[PDB]
């Protein structure tokens, strides 16, 4: 026996593909623990999830647990340095985050595998003896104020909080979880609250061991990890806090049959239908709400959405279960509305009820359940291995819900068929407890309530009894048929044997006028899956704003037309991505290799013989006008958008595209497609469970389909242009300034252009980014608290690179001078660090760059960047890392002095300032007169362009 451990669980059920090794257990103080041993992992990780969150905030200090969660990162009795924790991680290739939901607070990090204990020890102190320092608390309260600021003007957050504002206001559900400066400082001061005590009190009340789950993943054996967890976590105190429950639904009688008309920020049109339901978590072995979500949310022939779409009322639908908290849940059905749709809310809902009646009428269907069960069994068998940090974070939360032995499978494996539960839930999707919300600009002016926390304008009505009646009498509508057997369900899982000529990187196995094929058989993951990626180049996708619009519209219209047939493939784990790029088009097809040729074929064939529905065209066109307009409401950090336009040779503005959009007529589109398709080049990466012969074959089928149906011919080597980047003058500085009309913050992007990419240029910039990475966060946010969003790092585009800084702030772009201030802090800091501190940073970047991909598509993505950027440097990580180890402090000081210091002979600075809707401290250096960019075209015309990088 062991006193510290209440038990060890039995064998923890894992997929037989999972080579990782597992032990669950429960400590004497009640923490549920999963241990994960992966002797091959590069980074180790842990997470702790406390079953407490904002639903438990004092009614009089909204946001206290979100705030607590910020405060734990800022010092404890054992590690009092304010940023000890984020600094330790940073020097050891890790990072860390945390989130607070209504019932949970989840904290996770990763780190170099050699430093689990160091990281883990620092982390445990969050749960033992946080300082909540007086002065930290004063600063950090601004960061939370900024998180909320950011959300104020966003349609999702306003809807999310509005839902809670309109249930029982007595119910914890109507609390405001983010908090802000007002609720967390101003008003508590007005009321004589000592927030440091309130944090100490709440931590002390609720951070009990009996409400915690911890997961720890590392190279150590299961025994070693056990000792480690026992040692750092046994001492967490147990206060037997009863777990909070909410058996009473926040929506009672008077909340049902309500209609809400809401004014959005963006020009969007949506309908939200919602029914209150009991908590279904406990029925996870059968999962009735998933079953029904699958049916009502179906998109195949026969489906609810098929008809709403055919009547030109909705374009997309989502349905199924939505969590509330322990005690109450929701079932939703939500749709976007066309303009016609907006005038037929009533009929759309009646269709929803007609579709629900059809389910009552046909009863529960075991064959549907069997499909859901097989698909999840297979998903489970062959799940991609996860990145440690997400994985620990996830298991940590679900340890609160499932037996130890089941945590890994609980959410996949279905067991039990439950015509009773399916029928019970189905008996709640009735007009007598429906809630209806319509979001539309047409309610501008018409409304009379204002939600307090966000300012959302809305109106509230009883749904008229006569309407409830008509919905109550919905009869079968023969447009609605359950779906049929799903023919895309895969059945061939054989992993083809590894070829004698297979290679560790992709091999160019086809190099023709028409196509360039890169290919690799998977030699690492051994799952039955593959990725097939294609760039199609046509100079016409982007020749001008109008072509650009057309490429875009074409591809949307296509996807819209494939949707019904493609949906089944997607439930079966076969999916695809298809969009227009500044060069032409991008197609990715991913999932189980088994039926993939079928899907690829149907796509290219549709692409090449497409016929457009006039009605569909008109709808999609209108959604896209709105989409362009709505950009006006994106967040001020937009600064990135304008830099991207200022720095790239060719790029059309959202304004230009919008103008050109009225000239897009049906006749004009039909004409464009054959035009676009007539000369292409294709560069493909085929990668996964496939042979060279299969790959050549798949490539050639794409080619032949295009030739047959669209007479495609090759492009000339020269028309395969890449675009270039603007070359900034030595010693100059340009500012381009604009206003965000919607949000009341600023944003700024500051770019220090350095030089072309290459081994040495790259690694100089990367080491530098690594050394300044947590310091910038720590100074510009944590100390100076200039905004929530504060980012810094390398910028790469068009083969050039530089250092950038992005901040969203309430102070004006001021921001500049503080970054410049910071920049000097850093030279001096680089001078003052020990060699060993220098070399740890090298080591840390090295671990980051060499971290091996855990799954097929992570490996695909690295290769695809080498290909789409035409560097083709597949072994860049070893090369660049070898060179990295070479570098010294002098190199970095020289580099900084040459390209980055305020008086550097090759400084190249551009700043985008986005002003707000209205518009101790280190010493900021004096700055030059900037040059104000007046006009984007001119600014480009008056400067050189860089060369493009040479291939590998």
């Amino acid at each position: 026996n062991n006193p510290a451990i209440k038990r060890i669980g039995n064998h923890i059920t894992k997929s037989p593909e999972d080579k990782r090794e597992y032990r669950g257990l429960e400590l004497a103080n009640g923490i549920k623990v999963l241990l994960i041993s992966d002797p091959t992992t590069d980074k180790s990780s842990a997470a702790l999830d406390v079953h407490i969150g904002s639903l438990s905030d004092p009614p009089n200090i909204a946001g206290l647990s979100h705030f607590l969660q910020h405060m734990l990162f800022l010092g404890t009795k054992k590690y009092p340095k304010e940023n000890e924790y984020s600094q330790f991680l940073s020097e050891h290739a890790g990072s860390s985050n945390a989130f607070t939901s209504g019932e949970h607070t989840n904290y996770y990090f990763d780190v170099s595998h050699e430093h689990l204990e160091g990281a883990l020890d620092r982390f445990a102190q969050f749960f033992l003896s946080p300082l909540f320092d007086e002065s930290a608390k004063d600063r950090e309260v601004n960061a939370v104020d900024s998180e909320h600021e950011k959300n104020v003007m966003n349609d999702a957050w306003r809807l999310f909080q509005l839902e809670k504002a309109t249930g029982n206001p007595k119910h914890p559900f109507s609390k405001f979880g983010t908090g802000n400066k007002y609720t967390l400082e101003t008003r508590p001061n007005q009321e004589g609250i000592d927030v440091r005590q309130e944090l100490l009190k709440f931590h002390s009340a609720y951070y009990s061991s009996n409400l915690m789950a911890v997961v720890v993943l590392g190279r150590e054996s299961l025994d070693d990890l056990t000792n480690l967890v026992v040692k750092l976590f046994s001492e967490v105190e147990n206060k037997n806090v009863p777990l909070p429950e909410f058996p009473e639904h926040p929506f009672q009688e008077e909340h049902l049959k309500q209609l809400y008309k809401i004014v959005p920020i963006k020009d969007i049109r949506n309908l939200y239908v919602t029914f209150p339901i009991p908590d279904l978590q406990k029925y996870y072995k059968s999962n009735p709400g998933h079953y029904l979500g699958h049916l009502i949310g179906h998109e195949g022939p026969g489906s609810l959405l098929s008809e709403l779409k055919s009547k030109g009322w909705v374009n997309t639908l989502v349905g199924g279960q939505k969590e509330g908290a322990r005690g109450f849940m929701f079932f939703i059905i939500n749709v976007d509305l066309t303009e016609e749709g907006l005038l037929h809310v009533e009929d759309i809902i009646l269709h929803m009820f007609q579709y629900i009646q059809k389910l009552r009428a046909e009863g529960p269907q075991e064959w549907v359940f069997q499909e859901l069960k097989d698909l999840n069994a297979v998903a489970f068998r062959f799940k991609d291995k996860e990145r440690p940090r997400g994985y620990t974070s996830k298991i940590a939360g679900i340890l609160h819900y499932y037996p130890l032995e089941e945590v890994l499978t609980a959410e996949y494996l279905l067991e039990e068929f439950r015509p009773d539960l399916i029928e019970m839930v189905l008996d709640k999707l009735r007009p007598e407890n429906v809630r209806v919300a319509i979001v539309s600009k047409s309610f501008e002016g018409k409304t009379d309530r204002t939600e307090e926390w966000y300012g959302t304008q809305y109106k509230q009505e009883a749904i008229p009894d006569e309407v409830i009646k008509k919905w109550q009498n919905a009869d079968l509508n023969g447009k609605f048929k359950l779906p049929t057997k799903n023919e895309f369900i895969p059945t061939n899982f054989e992993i083809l044997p590894l070829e004698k000529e297979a290679t560790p990187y992709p091999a160019l196995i086809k190099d023709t006028a028409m196509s360039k094929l890169w290919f690799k058989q998977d030699d690492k993951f051994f799952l039955p899956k593959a990725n097939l990626n294609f760039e199609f180049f046509s100079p016409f996708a982007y020749v001008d704003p109008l072509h650009s619009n057309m490429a875009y519209l074409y591809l949307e219209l296509l996807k819209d037309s494939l949707n019904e047939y493609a949906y089944a493939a997607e439930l079966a784990g076969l999916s695809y991505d298809l969009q227009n790029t500044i060069y032409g088009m991008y197609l990715s097809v991913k999932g189980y290799n088994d039926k993939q040729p079928i899907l690829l074929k149907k796509i290219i064939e549709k692409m090449a013989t497409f016929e457009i529905d006039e009605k569909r065209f008109e709808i999609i066109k209108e959604a896209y006008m709105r989409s362009l307009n709505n950009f006006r409401a994106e967040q001020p950090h937009h600064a990135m958008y304008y830099l991207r336009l200022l720095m790239t040779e060719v790029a059309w503005t959202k304004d230009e595209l919008k103008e050109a959009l009225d000239d897009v007529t049906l006749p004009r589109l039909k004409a464009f497609i054959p035009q676009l398709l007539s000369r292409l080049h294709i560069e493909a990466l085929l990668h996964g469970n496939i042979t060279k012969q299969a790959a050549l074959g798949i490539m050639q089928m794409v080619e032949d389909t295009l030739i047959e149906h669209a007479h495609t011919k090759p492009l000339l080597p020269s028309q395969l242009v890449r675009y270039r980047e603007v070359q900034l003058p030595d010693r100059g500085w340009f500012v381009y300034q604009q206003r965000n009309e919607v949000h009341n913050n600023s944003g700024i992007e500051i770019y220090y252009q350095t030089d072309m990419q290459s081994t040495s240029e790259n690694m100089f910039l990367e080491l530098f980014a690594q050394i300044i990475s947590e310091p910038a966060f720590n100074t510009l946010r944590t100390k100076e608290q200039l905004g929530y969003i504060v980012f810094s790092g390398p910028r790469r585009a068009n083969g050039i690179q530089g250092l950038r800084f992005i901040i969203q702030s309430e102070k004006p772009p001021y921001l500049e001078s503080r970054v410049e201030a910071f920049l000097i802090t850093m030279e001096k800091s680089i001078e003052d660090m020990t060699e060993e501190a220098f070399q740890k940073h090298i080591q840390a970047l090295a671990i980051r760059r060499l971290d091996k991909p855990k799954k097929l598509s992570a490996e695909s993505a690295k290769y695809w960047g080498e290909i789409i950027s035409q560097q083709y440097n597949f072994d860049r990580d070893n090369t660049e890392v070898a060179y990295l180890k070479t570098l010294t402090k002098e190199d970095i000081i020289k580099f900084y002095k040459e390209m980055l210091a305020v008086d550097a002979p090759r400084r190249h600075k551009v700043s985008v300032h986005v002003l707000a809707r209205e518009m101790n401290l280190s010493q900021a250096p004096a700055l030059p007169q900037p040059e104000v960019i007046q006009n984007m075209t001119e600014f480009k015309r008056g400067l050189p362009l860089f060369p493009l990088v040479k291939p590998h």
């Binding site: 985050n97 989130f99 607070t100 959300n151 979880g177 997309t316 976007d336 967040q635």
Partner: peptide, 20 residues
């Protein structure tokens, strides 16, 4: 970090804001 239920076109939109 707070954040809330990402449904349909709210996940597409919200997830653009995380990824420049």
């Amino acid at each position: 970090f707070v954040n809330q239920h990402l449904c349909g076109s709210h996940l597409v939109e919200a997830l653009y804001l995380v990824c420049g």
